[PDB]
Amino acid sequence: RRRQLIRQLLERDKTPLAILFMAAVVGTLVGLAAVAFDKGVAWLQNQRMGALVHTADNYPLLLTVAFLCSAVLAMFGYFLVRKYAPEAGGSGIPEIEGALEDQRPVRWWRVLPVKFFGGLGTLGGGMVLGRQGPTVQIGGNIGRMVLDIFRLKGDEARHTLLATGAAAGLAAAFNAPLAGILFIIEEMRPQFRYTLISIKAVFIGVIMSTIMYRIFNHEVALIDVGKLSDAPLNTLWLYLILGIIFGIFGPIFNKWVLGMQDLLHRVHGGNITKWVLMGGAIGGLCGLLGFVAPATSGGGFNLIPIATAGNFSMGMLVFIFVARVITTLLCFSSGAPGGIFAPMLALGTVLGTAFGMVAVELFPQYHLEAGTFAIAGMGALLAASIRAPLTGIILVLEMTDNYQLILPMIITGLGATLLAQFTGGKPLYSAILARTLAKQEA
């Protein structure tokens, strides 16, 4: 195979022009789609806050339209999923993973309007779920769509424009172009065989997407954390320890999401009506919690700068981790449309902060800031539950811009995956795809 190689080496990186141009198209649409989905979620969260002000006196009436406003949107989102596109429940990453394996269909006529409007309901309602769920799957189907529309033929094109859409979708959600590209090549691509996915092409999609988001979202950071302190070599070993903690929690978390998926399935049994009702119940619980204890509900990006800054009592930090574990599980394991990535960032930040607190008091010789540990911890549940450490590290880097912590971030991340592996844990997206492929054969 020496002579085939010399042929291949000289032919390397010669992506078909058509694929390259189409990637620019896909990028752009995913960009605009993501921007719309973002403006939508914001508007409903806003109207929802304009409702509570209309009734800011009568506390029981006030706690009621908090519940109902979320309940309605929740149901409407659960319903669109159950009736028109069942594959648009949950994250959307296992599904787009399925499609890259050629084992799940990209029904873009149904999922685009379902995921987009159904998610617009669950997120805008204020449930604990992340945009990246919807934007990735949306982005994937938008990729499929321009395939079909322009009748592009070939395996390269199908796998590429699908990959490009997913990457443009992740990027746009976090203003993170590197995190999107890396996610394709670490996690999304088919893991057990070769593929012809042009990286240059995914790159182009991601650029356009990110430029679109930049047209409508300039001048304000998703997460602003300022420039934290450094980490001296004699301080690293503490980050290893923090990883090991994430490493034994990762798998335990994964079990709960899968377990709660089953346990919640008994409540409705598959029945579109009990399910949708259970949706507005979960939705309302979130909209309510979004009033009476906002850090237990919602996306969670708000409490990240706070936790990093040290402005939470250890008691509030313990409260937020428990309450958020409970509501992250309730929302994602229930089947609503929306990702689980982003709420893992809050969960990670909080646990990390909490660690740094204890680290600060036990070791004043180290001159610690608990916020260096929050930031190492932010991408760590991504590391131990999703087993995509290279993506969580680069994503966190892009969002927090604290490069001086790269070594502690890399160490916590690796510590988390190693102990996730070793204690019999599996990548969450892979164990969700698997369950779904398995039942498709049952």
Distance CA 167, CA 159 (A): 12
Q: Tokens for 85?
A: 């596109």
User: Was 91 annotated as part of a binding site?
Assistant: yes
* Closest CB 10 distance from its own copies, rounded Å: 5
Residue 234, contacted partner among its own copies, F ion, none, CB below 5-8 A by kind: none
**Residue at token pair 């709960």:** 256
Residues 324-353 that bind F ion (CB under 5 A): 339-341
Here the tokens at position 255 are 């079990």
Partner from F ion, its own copies, none binding residue 219, C-beta < 5-8 Å depending on class: none
Choice between 301 and 366, CB closer to F ion: 301
Judged by beta carbon distances under 5 to 8 A according to partner kind, the member of its own copies, F ion, none in contact with residue 411 is: its own copies
For its own copies, the closer of residues 320 and 344 by Cβ is 344
Task: Evaluate whether 391 touches 177 at the Cβ level (below 8 Å).
Answer: no
**Closest C-alpha to 169, from 195, 141, 191:** 141
Applying CB under 5 A, the span of 84-92, 176-184, 255-263, 300-308 interacting with F ion comes to 84-92
Return the number of the residue (275 or 429) whose C-beta is nearest F ion. 429
Instruction: Work out what residue 53 binds among F ion, its own copies, none; the CB cut-off runs from 5 to 8 Å by kind.
Output: none
Cβ–Cβ < 8 Å for 349, 307 = yes
The residues facing 90 across adjacent strands are 337
Residue 423 contacts which entry, its own copies, F ion, none (Cβ below 5-8 A, type-dependent): none
For tokens 């769920």, the residue is 133
Binding site for its own copies (CB under 8 A): 2-3, 5-6, 8-10, 12-15, 17, 20, 101, 103, 177-178, 181, 185-186, 191-194, 199-200, 203-204, 206-207, 210-211, 214-215, 218, 233, 236, 387, 389-390, 393-394, 397-398, 401, 403, 406-407, 410-411, 414, 417-418, 421-422, 426-427, 430-431, 433-434, 437-438, 440-441
429 in a labelled binding site: yes
Q: Which stretch binds F ion (CB under 5 A): 98-106, 125-133, 289-297, 314-322?
A: 125-133
224-247: b (≥16 Cβ within 10 Å) or e: ebeebeebeeebeebbbebbbbbb
For its own copies, the closer of residues 17 and 53 by Cβ is 17
Q: Nearer Cβ to F ion, position 339 or 427?
A: 339
CB of 386 to F ion, least distance (A): 8
Stretch that binds F ion, among 30-38, 129-137, 169-177, 222-230 (CB under 5 A): 129-137
340 binds, among F ion, its own copies, none (CB under 5 to 8 A by kind): F ion
How many degrees, rounded to 5, is the angle at CA 296 between CA 219 and CA 350? 70
From F ion, its own copies, none, which one binds at residue 258 (CB under 5 to 8 Å depending on kind)? none
Q: Is 177 among the residues that bind F ion (CB under 5 A)?
A: no
The answer to whether 341 is annotated as binding is yes
Residue 120 in the binding site for F ion (CB under 5 A): no
Shortest spacing between CB 93 and F ion, in angstroms = 5
Our CB check for its own copies shows the closer of 135 and 412 to be 412
Q: Which residues bind F ion (CB under 5 A)?
A: 91, 133, 339-341
Binding residues, as ranges, are 91, 340-341, 429
Annotated binding-site residues for chloride read 91, 340-341, 429
